[PDB]
């Protein structure tokens, strides 16, 4: 009885918090990237690494 | 809150992965949802799986239809989708493994049948749904489901017939 209700109550906050957390991950990354003067190649490279990190995380989250 | 922003595909994120995750999520939601109403769809309440008298649902798709009651249809549907998610050749669990080139097909299929669950619940068992405070949670789950589906056009609109009653109403 309660399970579905609890889960659904917490789910919106959950997924929205996930969204903003990912946004902040990216923004934090490029914020540190702006300082210390890396070249465009490294930028794109580590960008791809970030995307791969996220995809990996959600895939891992999906199962156990 | 609003989910239009959330359900969107992020930069660099593979579509099939996103779809897989969300599909699994909605699958769990629906699973618990029917898990709370399983005592009410008793095959005497729902002799045939149908989204109301007009909109009727058959398991297989024609030459001709075959008898399909609701508890059978749904019990199966759960078992089936579970088998699909556990299929490593469709839903990989290791990062090195890529999706099959036919993923979006069974994605659209699964999501379609999940919507069919949403439909039987919204129509046939709307009354016992209110017997416990639950309509809000259902509205939320279904809202997220529809926002996602629409945002990526994963179910034919002709299929979304028996619930439009709230669809356009919910996306105010
Ligand atoms: Zn029923």
Author numbering:
A (entry chain U): 635 to 698
B (entry chain A): 39 to 100, 104 to 213
Question: What does the study report here?
Answer:
To exert full kinase activity, MST1/2 and LATS1/2 requires coactivators, the scaffolding proteins Salvador homolog 1 (SAV1) and Mps One binder 1 (MOB1), respectively. Phosphorylated MOB1 protein is switched ON to increase the binding affinity to LATS1/2 and this binding accelerates auto-phosphorylation of the activation loop, A-loop (also referred to as activation segment or T-loop), of LATS1/2 kinases for full activation. The phosphorylation of MOB1 occurs at two threonine residues, Thr12 and Thr35, located at the N-terminal extension out of the C-terminal globular MOB core domain, and is required for binding to LATS/NDR kinases. Here we report the results of structural and biochemical studies of full-length mouse MOB1B in the autoinhibited form and that of the MOB core domain bound to the NTR region of LATS1 (hereafter referred to as the MOB1B-LATS1 complex).
We determined the structure of the complex between the N-truncated dominant active form of MOB1B in complex with the NTR domain of LATS1 to independently ascertain which structure of the MOB1-LATS1 complex is correct. The crystal structure of the complex between the NTR (residues 621-703) domain and N-terminal truncated MOB1B (33-216) was determined at 2.96 Å resolution. The structure reveals that the NTR domain forms a V-shaped bihelical structure formed by antiparallel long helices, αA (Gln636-Met668) and αB (Gln674-Ala697), which bind the negatively-charged and nonpolar patched surface of MOB1B. The V shape of the NTR domain is stabilized by formation of an inter-helical hydrophobic core with nonpolar residues (Leu663 and Met667 from the α1 helix, Leu672 from the connected loop, and Met680 and Leu684 from the α2 helix) and inter-helical salt bridges comprising residues, Arg659-Glu688 and Glu664-Arg681. The obtained structure is essentially the same as that of the pMOB1A-LATS1 complex, with small overall root mean square (r.m.s.) deviation (0.79 Å). The helical axis of the αA helix is kinked at His645 with the following part of the αA helix docked into the hydrophobic groove between antiparallel helices H2 and H7, and the αB helix interacts with the negatively-charged patch. Four negatively-charged acidic residues (Glu49 and Glu51 from the H1-H2 loop, and Glu55 and Asp63 from the H2 helix) of MOB1B form direct salt bridge/hydrogen bond formations with six positively-charged residues (His645, Arg656, Arg659 and Lys660 from the α1 helix, and Arg693 and Arg696 from the α2 helix) from the NTR domain. The observed MOB1B-LATS1 interactions in our structure were verified with mutational analysis. Alanine mutants of highly conserved arginine residues (R656A, R693A and R696A) displayed decreased binding affinity to less than 20% of the wild-type.
